[PDB]
Design a protein around this ligand. Structure first.
Ligand SMILES: [Cl-]
Ligand SMILES: [Cl-]
Lengths: 594, 600
């Protein structure tokens, strides 16, 4: 279990917080001489770099956009003098992909994983009342011992080029907000809630972790601040009579309030009373079935790359609502915590995905996810280091996101090898670990490439429901062969039906690249009309199987990828353009999903 | 009465034809010296030029693209020896806009009007069994004394620049096929058919004009070649028992055969395909074969990448497959008569045509699309140029009607588009055009024209002349667009309520309505110029149309993106197309398909 708290920062009497967002100093370190040359003390010749954002798309030259290797940030903040006697942490929403944090010259901690928060305890070096310095050494290379997976090519000048095993640009930097926070010396470290429904009434079971021994009181407030339940102890049950349940696209948020007393700490968070259970082939939310309708997405916008902005969230949610979606998948990595906060208010359902993408050794991975070629990926001697990373990223993800009502499943892989017992052994461990970290035991899943065929795949028995990525009519029998493609699709769904697994299937990826404004009569692959015809055919197949309980189309919006001959300025399978405007097919979803 | 035949060329024993399409020789004449310098005998420094085609879009520099003034074409053809003792004509489908034809050095004839055939009798100068020469001086300037109307600016270096009073590019040259043909010394010059429906049977009234006095017999053949009627005489009635009528989008064509007989011999033989059908306006209704018809389709343009107005059959084939997928039954030949092939093919496919003379730009404005609702009168029909303009307007009408009157597809003549009509000088002008048109058409079929918003119900003086009234309105675009579209609808309905209150008891067709739409431009919520806005503008205008019993047709503007003269309001032509210039469909094309599948 973890040496820090994953809880979002708040500001009350006992807990303080100050934003470090703004313009930082930035400098590339291509010869990797920073540590030995005093950069922990300040950067020798930096530039200005916005935070949060991704560094790549600001520059005007290739070597800098495509930089791969070591690079540094530095900034300076004044701590209020009133934060003596408090524990003081730096909280980075993310450090992509790995980094060591230095503060006032001292190395505080290093982290691996570029999509989950990083906590640095600077209590012993922070100078309250004075100006303080923070310096972060970051690395954005890809390998097969960390997620997401890939490789690093050295070119003739010795400069490094990222060669990912995934299909999305390797944005990196400090992409999410950065805080400095003050906690009490005895503090709430973690807590977990589970829900039971008793007719109209409800139980909120909870457990609490603290950095101390003092008694804990837990209060639960309704939307208007009035009290509805109170229990003493670090373990308890809250009784909410005539409970107001969090519903799909109709949220109700209670407020939990955790206290440590003699009052030493207070933590407050919005939660939603709802239950998630798989009965047979159905997904039950509050004991009634739900059908998932929505999109795979990316944290991706012009200029900012993966940088968080609230304006992107607002628009992306006003578009999801306009299509009448109810659900999205945080593909292929946990998002910024603000996305889940807002999903909670709006009643969207989230499949939360750990970044286990790239577990097949292929640099053009999307044509290759149906080629039939096994890459011997889980037979290699780096696999134990990889497994340790994957489990640690699952643990940090679940701890961070488990108390959001919108999060209803965990996706623990996208398009890996599953056709050999080497991969069963691997994934069995991962699921085992995820089952222990989630106090609610909500459904665990992953998304399968076409190569994980019903006859050969070893891993679908680990899944509570099964997610399929399928491109019938695009990478398989596309264009004039599109009727062959429908058959082949039905052929496979027939074989899955024949297995009588009695579990739900969700299509988590299907789509066509579509250039906005390419019209052709008759339609051709890449036009707007072909996208509509494609979707109308996948819909017919989905609607032919009682156990298909969900469609998450790929993608919500055009996004940026590694450049290559099959990628025309990124990936054009969006239903919206990258500036968040709808292609002709968005209307297809809107109508179907009403 | 015209000094030549408008009859399309055929090839039998009595009548022979030869195409002159190919690379011709071409030369600009900016100093206007060709005649004094002997260009009538050949050009001194030519380049090659495709025929048929408009010259403008081939070149890579502005001076040649935008050329305005005199320019010359030349080619050479071999006349077979066997054409001695025939009358030999050159037949240009069109010479744009005016020209003078020369054959082996000799001025044969001159013609004014850029969109109808030019016939030049070269019988005295032709040399059969030898190689012959044709040379044409063309001028593409615009003025206020011919159609279509514009003006001509002289730049500071002496260059002429066309400044049209219309919104389409001033393509010009030899835009249509060219033939040399041989006719008999006694030939059929002209004929005309009218029809009456007799239950299962039908009458084909007719009349023939020849160049001599030998007698005529007229035969009528069904679709399979079999004889169904015969009559002696230059005027007659053919009696067709168990007639197959020509019906909208369900065409049947008879062959008519006109012979000039020397007892047991044949002197001339002309064959055209025709279609029995009747057209009549009864009250507010447009009756085809005695049932009501709702017009659904488009205003078009003879326009295409590289070719300009140049004629190609593939442009036809694609454009008709698109109209059929759309479920249209109609189109208007805005704003000039088309190549004859367009009509021939509309006959096979059963489309209805409104045939438009080129009477456009009768109002002095160079940005004339912002000005058809401005409210500003330009005294256009009180100028002393007007009597000359009237004469060539009538002349183009007579030539259009004489040419096109025997196509079943042609159900009405449009004699103006967006002129000034709020004035008695304009009533007196158009009373003459309409009176002329009535006489040249043997079927006395409906005559109309299209009115700008400026020609309000209270002010207009010209709508009485029309058998039905065509309106060009842009409520939701030029008027009260974008955020104000709610208001554009109430304004529209207020105008229609005033037309209603006049109780004119005539049908109204909407011949223009549309929005510039950039393919690929998507906005949510929609904005003027987005594809989404096109669809909404349309849904709005349909609600208005459907609120009025007397609205009996809707021709959207335009079938396809097309080229205009350039300027700040024109992003590479006009983008009111429902299809792109390369004839693929924007999102509002299915709006039409669905509405029109489920009308009548
Ligand atoms: Cl460069
Ligand atoms: Cl130039």
């Amino acid at each position: 279990m973890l040496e820090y708290s994953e809880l979002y920062p708040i500001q009350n009497g006992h807990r303080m917080m100050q934003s470090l967002d703004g313009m930082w100093k930035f400098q590339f370190d291509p010869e990797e001489i920073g540590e030995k040359s005093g950069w922990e003390n300040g950067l020798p010749a930096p530039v200005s770099m916005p935070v949060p954002s991704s560094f790549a798309d600001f520059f005007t030259d290739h070597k800098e956009r495509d930089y791969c290797g070591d690079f540094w940030y530095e900034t300076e903040f004044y701590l209020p003098a009133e934060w003596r006697n408090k524990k003081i942490w730096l909280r980075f929403g993310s450090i992509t992909h790995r980094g060591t944090v230095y503060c006032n010259g001292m190395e505080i901690t290093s982290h691996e994983g570029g999509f989950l928060p990083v906590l640095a305890d600077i209590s012993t070096v922070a100078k309250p009342g004075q100006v303080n310095q923070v310096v972060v050494k970051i690395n954005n290379e890809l390998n097969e011992t960390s997620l997401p997976c890939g490789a690093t090519k050295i070119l003739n000048n010795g400069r490094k080029l990222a060669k990912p095993y995934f299909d999305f640009f390797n944005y990196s930097g400090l992409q999410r907000s950065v805080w400095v926070i003050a906690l009490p010396e005895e503090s709430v470290k973690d807590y977990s809630v589970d829900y039971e429904l008793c007719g109209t009434d409800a139980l909120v079971k909870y457990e609490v972790v603290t950095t101390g021994e003092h008694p804990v009181i837990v209060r639960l407030l309704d939307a208007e601040g009035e009290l509805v339940a109170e229990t003493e102890g670090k373990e308890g049950i809250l009784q909410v009579a005539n409970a107001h349940l969090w519903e799909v696209r109709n949220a109700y948020l209670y407020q939990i309030v955790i206290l440590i007393t003699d009052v030493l700490d207070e933590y407050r968070e919005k939660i939603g009373i709802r239950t998630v259970r798989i009965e047979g082939t159905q997904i039950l939310l509050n004991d009634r079935p739900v059908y998932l309708k929505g999109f795979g997405k990316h944290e991706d916008f012009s200029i900012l790359g993966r940088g968080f902005h609230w304006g992107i969230v607002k628009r992306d949610f006003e578009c999801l609502k306009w299509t009448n979606a109810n659900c999205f998948r945080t593909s292929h990595y946990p998002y910024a915590e603000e996305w889940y906060q807002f999903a909670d208010e709006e009643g969207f359902l989230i499949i939360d995905e750990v970044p286990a993408v790239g577990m097949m050794r292929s640099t053009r991975n999307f044509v290759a996810a149906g080629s039939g070629n096994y890459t011997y990926f889980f037979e290699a001697l780096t696999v134990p280091e990889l497994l340790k990373s994957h489990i640690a990223d699952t643990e940090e993800m679940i701890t961070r996101d488990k108390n959001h009502p919108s999060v209803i499943a965990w996706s623990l892989f996208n398009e890996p090898e599953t056709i050999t017992d080497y991969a069963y052994e691997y994934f069995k461990e991962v699921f085992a670990a995820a089952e222990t970290y989630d106090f609610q035991s909500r459904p665990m899943t992953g998304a399968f490439e076409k190569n994980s065929k019903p006859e050969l795949c070893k891993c679908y028995p680990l899944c509570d429901f099964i997610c399929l990525n399928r491109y019938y009519g695009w990478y398989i029998s596309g264009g004039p062969e599109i009727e062959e493609a429908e058959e082949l699709f039905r052929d496979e769904m027939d074989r899955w039906k024949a297995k009588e697994l009695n579990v739900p299937f969700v299509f988590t990826e299907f789509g066509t690249d579509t250039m906005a404004g390419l019209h052709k009569l008759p339609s051709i692959m890449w036009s707007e009309e072909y996208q509509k015809e494609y979707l109308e055919m996948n819909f017919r197949v989905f609607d032919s199987y009682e156990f298909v309980q969900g469609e998450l189309a790929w993608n919500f919006a055009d996004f940026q990828t590694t450049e290559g001959i099959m990628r025309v300025d990124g990936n054009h399978k969006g239903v919206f353009t990258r500036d968040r405007q709808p292609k002709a097919a968005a209307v297809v979803f809107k109508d179907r999903w009403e």
